């Protein structure tokens, strides 16, 4: 399960690449989605590779982001252990985080909006004109690199 | 093994390449059977621009007709090694061609499952000169 965050805007991006992001429920910059690691989804991320940042986050990190940015499919009801426990097949955020990372369920499946609307990266990111290996922020990241970004955007 | 390997006469073709015929009558006499006309192909400067039209005649003899002919025909020639083919054929002279081959030649002349004759079963000049020379005449 990889976390996907759009870091580059839609202006001038190929249309089929933009439609791919939308199919992955991402419609804005800084919006994050959780995608299972399958052959089908694999082709998709590889296609949006140059306008996003993705990788597998640590259980803790996913827990922090879920706590701070997860939302109900509808309404402004805050999402916390009590909410999770009273609306999902889990006891708390941790139970959810684990099930997501292990690809046993999805946010939509548990009555949550498929997207985590993150905040701009505190302290800024490494840039959207270069990949990770070249010092940029685009493309695949380490769990530590991905956690660094997601935590900065908490 | 030797019986089905010892040569024989497939056919004796006698033909007169004229070039415009009246010569059929002698072939009909010297061989004993009806001859056939010979047409040419391709236009020719030597006033031979007519593709299909009499230009020669021939008679193909087999079995007795062939041998009864060679008996009185071979003595009229002076066979030599060069006068022999690479397949074991020889022709002299009015041309006179003798086609020799082994028993199961039919395998290449039949319609169904025909097949080409293996070089091993193909007659040889050596085997040819022999067989023939081994019957009323000399070599080189």
């Amino acid at each position: 399960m990889h976390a996907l965050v759009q870091l580059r805007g839609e202006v001038n991006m190929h249309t089929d690449i933009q439609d791919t992001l939308e199919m992955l429920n991402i419609h804005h910059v800084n919006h994050c989605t959780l995608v299972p690691e399958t052959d089908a989804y694999r082709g998709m991320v590889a296609k949006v590779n140059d306008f996003v940042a993705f990788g597998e986050p640590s259980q803790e990190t996913l827990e922090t982001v879920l706590a701070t940015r997860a939302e109900p499919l509808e309404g402004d009801a805050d999402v916390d252990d009590e909410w999770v426990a009273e609306h999902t097949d889990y006891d708390d955020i941790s139970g959810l985080a684990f099930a997501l990372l292990s690809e046993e369920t999805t946010l939509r499946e548990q009555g949550l909006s498929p997207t985590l609307r993150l905040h701009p990266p505190r302290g800024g990111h490494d840039g959207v004109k270069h990949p990770v290996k070249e010092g940029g922020q685009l493309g695949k990241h380490d769990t530590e690199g991905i956690d660094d970004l997601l935590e900065a955007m908490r | 093994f030797h019986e089905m390997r010892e040569p024989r006469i497939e056919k004796v073709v006698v033909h007169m390449g004229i070039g415009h015929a009246n010569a059929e009558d002698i072939l009909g006499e010297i061989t004993g059977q009806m001859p056939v006309r010979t047409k040419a192909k391709r236009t020719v400067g030597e006033f031979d621009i007519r593709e299909g039209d009499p230009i020669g005649a021939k008679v193909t003899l087999r079995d007795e007709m062939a041998e009864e002919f060679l008996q009185t025909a071979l003595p009229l020639a002076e066979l030599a090694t060069s006068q022999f083919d690479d397949t074991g054929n020889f022709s002299f002279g009015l041309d006179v061609t003798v086609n020799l081959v082994r028993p199961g030649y039919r395998v290449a002349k039949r319609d169904k499952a025909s097949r080409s004759i293996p070089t091993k079963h193909r007659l040889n000049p050596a085997d040819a000169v022999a067989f023939i020379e081994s019957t009323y005449d000399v070599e080189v």
């Binding site: - | 319609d111 169904k112 499952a113 025909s114 097949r115």
Partner: protein, 186 residues
């Protein structure tokens, strides 16, 4: 053989056993084929149908198993060929086959030949096969008459292993008589 670009004919073409152009025209009928073959000593009839991995023979008859019903004569003649066709035809009706198209393979359509005799036999067996009567030898020849008279010009029995002296077309009748009959184990 010569190189990469070299074109080798289909196997059955180089073996000189299948005339594909005639084959295709045959298959276009949509009907089973009455495949008539012949060897120096024998004659074979098969009802072949098209199949996924190759043709499919539904019924057939050989001149050999003709004896199985009372035949002590040679098996490479006209009477032989006809009866074989009839035998194959009868078995054809057994398996539910009702019509066919003559496939003489690489044999010649000579009038009164054996492949046409095999056809007349298969047709009398009740099979519906497109044909032409004035191409079939006359009844008597099928029976074996032509060979009887040949033996007539005797001096030395036509047949070696005395099957009979003045040969027999009347036997052909006995065998045909035995096949057209119901009983018979096809």
């Amino acid at each position: 053989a010569t190189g990469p670009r070299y074109k080798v004919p289909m196997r059955r073409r180089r073996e000189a056993r299948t005339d594909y152009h005639q084959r295709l025209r045959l298959l276009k009928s949509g009907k089973p084929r009455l495949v008539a073959r012949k060897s120096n000593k024998h004659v074979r009839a098969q009802l072949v149908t098209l199949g996924p991995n190759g043709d499919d023979t539904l019924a057939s008859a050989h001149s050999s198993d003709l004896a199985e019903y009372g035949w002590e004569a040679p098996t490479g003649n006209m009477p032989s060929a006809y009866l074989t066709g009839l035998l194959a035809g009868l078995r054809a009706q057994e398996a539910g086959v009702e019509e066919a198209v003559l496939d003489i393979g690489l044999n010649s359509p000579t009038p009164g030949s054996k492949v046409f005799a095999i056809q007349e036999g298969a047709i009398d067996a009740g099979l519906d096969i497109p044909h032409n009567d004035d191409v079939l030898a006359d009844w008597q020849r099928t029976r074996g008459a032509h060979i009887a008279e040949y033996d007539e010009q005797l001096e030395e029995p036509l047949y070696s292993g005395d099957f009979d002296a003045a040969d027999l077309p009347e036997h052909f009748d006995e065998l045909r008589e035995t096949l057209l009959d119901g009983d018979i184990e096809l």
